[PDB]
Structure formats: C-alpha cells, structure tokens
Specification:
It is classed as transferase/transferase inhibitor. The complex is a heterotrimer of chains A (258), B (296) and C (5). Chain A is mainly alpha-helical and 258 residues long. Helices cover 58% and strands 0% of the residues of chain A. Chain A is globular, with a radius of gyration of 18 Å. Chain B has 2 domains: 1-84, Phosphorylase Kinase, domain 1, CATH 3.30.200; 85-296, Transferase(Phosphotransferase), domain 1, CATH 1.10.510.10. In chain B, strands 1-2-3-5-4 form a 5-stranded antiparallel sheet, with helices on one face. In chain B, strands 6-8-9 form a 3-stranded antiparallel sheet. In chain B, strands 7-10 form a two-stranded antiparallel sheet. In chain B, 41% of the residues are buried. The chains are: A mainly alpha (258), B alpha+beta (296), C little secondary structure (5).
Chain lengths: 258, 296, 5
C-alpha cells in the first residue's frame, strides 16, 4: 500500500549512509585491484543467471564485498572466496530458496572446500555485524518506477541495466550513493527511450535536481557509451535476453542535452 | 556465554531450544535462543540471518528486543528480553472466561503500533499468529520471532507453496498472487483480534481450498465488484460456490459497533483497500484505550 | 571457474 513509501524512502535514504563502503579502499588494498573487482562482480552476475537468482541478490552481494574489503585486506587468491560467501549470505537473506553450499562450491570449480566457504560466511557476518538489509540501487529504482507516466517496461529494464553496469566498476561509482546512481540511471534510461527527463515528482521526493545529478550522470553516460567495448560483458549478455526487451541493443545517445 | 546460567527451557521452535536464563553479573533475565549450526553442510540458516538483521534495526516497545548476539565457532546464541508467555497459551487459559474486552483493545492497539513501525521500516512479518505474540505482566504485548520476516525494498516474491500457516493466511495468497504486501500482516491481525474475542479461530481451514471456503462462507464470495481482479487470479475458479456475506455481529457477537467496523476493514478482500496499520491506530475503536494487566 | 588474477 501507498501509505508507507515516503517513510521507507526517507529511511532507505538514512540507512544508505550507514551501510556505506570506504571510497578509497581498493587503494589501501595491497594485492587486489579495481579490475580484479570487476572480474569478480562480472562472475557474480553470471553465477546469478545460472541459478536464476534475483537481481537484488546480486546488488546485495556486491555491497557485502565492498564493506568487507573496507576493513579486511584480502589476497587475490582468497577474493573469490570472499565473493562466494557474499553471494551465499545475500542468497540466504533475499531468495525464497537459495542454492546449496555445494552449488556455491561448484560455481567456483572445487576451488574452495565447502567448509572454507561456510566459515567465511561467518567471518563476513562478523565484520558487518549482521547488517545485511543494505539499501541498493535496485531498491531505489523500484521505488521510483512508480512515478512513470505513462508506464513503460523498456525504461524499467534499461535503468536496471545501467545500474548493474555500475556494480562492475568502483572506479568512479563507489563515491555515489545508490539513491543518486539509481537517480542517474532512471534518467538516462528515460532519456534514452522516450526523450523525457527525470521528473519533477521525484525532484521533490528525493531533493534531486537534474543539475545535482549531473556529475554521476556524465560518468554513467560514458560507461553506457563504452559498454560494448568493456572488458566484462556478462551483464550485457544477460540484458540481451528478451526477458528485458533487449534494452542492451538500443543505441546510446551520444549526447545528453545538458 | 560464561556469564549466563540456563535456568530452564521455556519453549522453542525455529533455531532451537530457548531457555530462560539470568546474567550472573547484572542479574537480568533473558531468553537465550540457541541456534544449533551446521558448520559442515549448510551454514547459518536463512531464518537466523533475517531475524538478526531486521531486529537489529527495529528498536521499539512493541517489538521484542534483540540484546546481543554471541557468535562462537560451532554455536550461535541470541539474547532477548524475557517475556512471560504467548498470547496463544494465554488464551487457552482464559478460554472459558474470555480475555476481557478492554485488554483485547490494548493488545490490538499495541500490535498495531509495532506492526506499523515494522512496515514503515520495509519489513513484513509474514507469520503473525497468537503463538508468536509475547505478553508480560505489565500488560505489554510485542511482536516476536522474525524468522520468516522479509525486507521489502523490492516486492517480496511469494512462495511457490507457502510455508507460513493456514489459519491466518490472506485470500490473495490462497489464490496465488505474485507478491506479498503489508496487507497480509493486517489480515492476520484481523484474525487474532477475532480469535481473542470469540475464543475460537475465525477461519480454521483444513487445507488451502477449505481455508478459502471458510473465508468465503463467512465474508461472502469475492467477485469483481468487491475486489477487481479476483476472477483472473492463478487459483481462482468459475466453479467456486456462491455464499452470502454474514452480518459481522453474527460472526463476532460480543464486540461493539466500532470494533465490528474496524474488524471489517482489516478483513476487506482487496489488498489495495485493506486498512493499513497507521489508520487502524486512528480508529474510533481506540479512543477509550487503557492498559489493563492480564491474569496469567 | 577458478578466477586467476
């Protein structure tokens, strides 16, 4: 029921600051690198197709890894383990029935033992102090969408697409809150498909002027424009499928009218 | 864990064995949830994951207080404020006399504040029922057991074949809709309210279909007029019997006019029209509310 | 999929 939004929105806009990763964490990390991080999130995007997981599970899972690496240094050899226990926690928090651990040990090619995965779940838990109800881009995209006159499922499918792209690269994106990334993704999706503009309805709800969106909007444009060329492709290959109206085939606008 | 002395097991359920116990240092009395743990072939169970995280965010008088989590290598302890028993076993003991009107109104009013606080923090319970509602001797009731509870920042996909219970399950889930809403929690409240009043469960189905038909037999058979869309829902059938809506005074005699009024808005069929917890609190029925204490 | 890094 529409009696409870605002309160949820406000509260999501509050919870989002406390669940925040450190913006320059990849650079205090001795062994691992933004591109290792890209490879990892790409693999997790693909793990989710194989097991027909929900998209929030993938968003949630990345959040864990980022908040995990903001206080734990990891070797490049134990990253895929840190990633696996995130997707299992995320799975266990969000999915109706999650994959078995065996399945989570199998997605990784008998790399880590089932026991290693499990007692890395406990360590993830310890370090985030059982704070898993993290707000994510996908959460805010959904809360928008409601403001969409006329409704239209290519915008929705395309904003989701753009917002997953931003999971892949922390390079720019880790200095934006999900509420803004979502905002920037909703606008770019809407501007790409219809030509319309980030509406005044949620300029009041969110306090987000188009102008205030500008910076992350530019970043998320470039990222869009360059998507087909990117080292990672798992997301684009997933948003090819007609589950999504092949949003990812649509042609970026090489300008933004800003 | 060394600071807690197990006094006795006061029930159980999910996770496992739940003891009363006192802090040997402070003297506080707590309920330890002791969750068993499969470190070889499962991990931390989804229910534990949900309960701990959601409750860690819901600080509020009518929601059972998670105090500490104690997280050893092979064991996982949760630490809760003690409360003295559950609505359910209270009603067995008060059935024959009946729970006093004024107390029942206090209870509904408190459950409606905690439910409201839950739904305004994107959290459904999905498993309200008298045996999951705690009472103390100072007349407080609190929501407890957040094991099936889910956060709804995104809509909550519904269970294939639901796990939740029959008796307090909303028609829209009985006809297999795609999603939960805050409204199913209200429908559940609306049944506990009835039960506390009438000493027996409002809709004691013996199976998904029977539960429907008992519903249907008492509030009439949903059509389009009352609930647009029903006809076209996965589990709805042209062959459904056509019953007539009973007077509510026929269904919950003892209640007064304003309680009937409100009971009926909690049982409205269309989710989109069923009353939210916020409103309920605003209802006439709560004008003369006090805080009676129960005879346990 | 072993990720080699």
């Amino acid at each position: 029921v529409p009696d409870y939004h605002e309160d949820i929105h406000t509260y999501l806009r509050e919870m989002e600051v406390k669940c925040k990763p450190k913006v320059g964490y990849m650079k205090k990390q001795p062994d691992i690198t933004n591109s290792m991080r890209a490879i990892l999130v790409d693999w997790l995007v693909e793990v989710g197709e194989e097991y027909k997981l929900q998209n929030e599970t993938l968003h949630l899972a990345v959040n864990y890894i980022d908040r995990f690496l903001s206080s734990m240094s990891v070797l490049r050899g134990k990253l895929q383990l840190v990633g696996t226990a995130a997707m299992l926690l995320a799975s266990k928090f969000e999915e109706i029935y999650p994959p078995e651990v065996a399945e989570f040990v199998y997605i990784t090619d008998d790399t880590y033992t089932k026991k290693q995965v499990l007692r890395m779940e406990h360590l993830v838990l310890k370090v985030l102090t059982f704070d898993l109800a993290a707000p994510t881009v996908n959460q805010f995209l959904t809360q928008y969408f409601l403001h969409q006159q006329p409704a239209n499922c290519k915008v929705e499918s395309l904003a989701m697409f753009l917002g997953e792209l931003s999971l892949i690269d922390a390079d720019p994106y880790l200095k934006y809150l999900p509420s803004v990334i979502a905002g920037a993704a909703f606008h770019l999706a809407l501007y790409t498909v219809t030509g319309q503009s980030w509406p005044e309805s949620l300029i009041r709800k969110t306090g987000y002027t188009l102008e205030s969106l500008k910076p992350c909007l530019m970043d998320l444009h470039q990222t869009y424009l360059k998507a087909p060329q990117h080292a990672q492709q798992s997301i684009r290959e997933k948003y090819k499928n007609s589950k999504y109206h092949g949003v990812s085939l649509l042609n970026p606008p090489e300008t933004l009218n800003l | 864990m060394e600071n807690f002395q197990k006094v006795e097991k006061i029930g159980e359920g999910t996770y496992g064995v739940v003891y009363k116990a006192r802090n040997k240092l402070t003297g506080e009395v707590v309920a330890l949830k002791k969750i068993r743990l499969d470190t070889e072939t499962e991990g931390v169970p989804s229910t534990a994951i949900r309960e701990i995280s959601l409750l860690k965010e819901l600080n509020h008088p009518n929601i059972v207080k998670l105090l500490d989590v104690i997280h050893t290598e092979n064991k996982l302890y949760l630490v809760f404020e003690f409360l003295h028993q559950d609505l359910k076993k209270f009603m067995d003991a008060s059935a024959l006399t009946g729970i006093p009107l004024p107390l029942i109104k206090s209870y509904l009013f408190q459950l409606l504040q905690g439910l409201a606080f839950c739904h305004s923090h994107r959290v459904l319970h999905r498993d309200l029922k008298p045996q999951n509602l705690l009472i103390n001797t100072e007349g407080a009731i609190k929501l407890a057991d957040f094991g099936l509870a889910r956060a709804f920042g995104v809509p909550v996909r519904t269970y294939t074949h639901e796990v939740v219970t029959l008796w307090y399950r909303a028609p829209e889930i009985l006809l297999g809709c795609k999603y939960y809403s805050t409204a199913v929690d209200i429908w559940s409240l609306g049944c506990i309210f009835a039960e506390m009043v009438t000493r027996r469960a409002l809709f004691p189905g013996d199976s998904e279909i029977d539960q429907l038909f008992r519903i249907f037999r008492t509030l009439g058979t949903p059509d389009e007029v009352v609930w647009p869309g029903v006809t076209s829902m996965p589990d709805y059938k042209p062959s459904f019997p056509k019953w007539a809506r009973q007077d509510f005074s026929k269904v919950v005699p003892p209640l007064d006019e304003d309680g009937r009024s409100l009971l009926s808005q909690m049982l409205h069929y269309d989710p989109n029209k069923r009353i939210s917890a916020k409103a309920a609190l605003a209802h006439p029925f709560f004008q003369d509310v006090t805080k009676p204490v129960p005879h346990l | 999929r072993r990720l080699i890094f």
